[PDB]
């Protein structure tokens, strides 16, 4: 059962790492979508680069 703990701790580390990286890149992408739809939700049509 100690060997099972070790592999379990390895697997926990893999999921914690994977979830940390995944949530960081995906949250940065989600935050990018929020910046786009908050700062420029077709507001570029009011600007129109005139």
């Amino acid at each position: 059962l100690r060997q099972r703990h070790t592999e379990l701790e390895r697997e926990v580390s893999r999921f914690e790492d994977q979830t940390q990286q995944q949530r960081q890149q995906y949250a940065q992408a989600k935050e990018s979508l929020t910046t786009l739809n908050r700062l420029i939700p077709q507001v570029t049509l009011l600007l129109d680069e005139t």
Partner: protein
């Protein structure tokens, strides 16, 4: 911030790409978190065993 120029002239399509990412965010974190949590309980069992 993301991309270097990356079609900023008309960026509407990218929001739709980011939506697929946002859906997959929830799936990927919900499953991952549940897996580690399942093993946290199993660890406690193994610990209790």
């Amino acid at each position: 911030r993301q991309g270097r120029q990356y079609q900023a002239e008309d960026l509407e399509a990218l929001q739709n790409e980011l939506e697929a990412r946002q859906e997959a965010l929830s799936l990927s974190v919900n499953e991952g978190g549940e897996r580690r949590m399942e093993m946290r309980q199993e660890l406690e069992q193994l610990k209790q065993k």
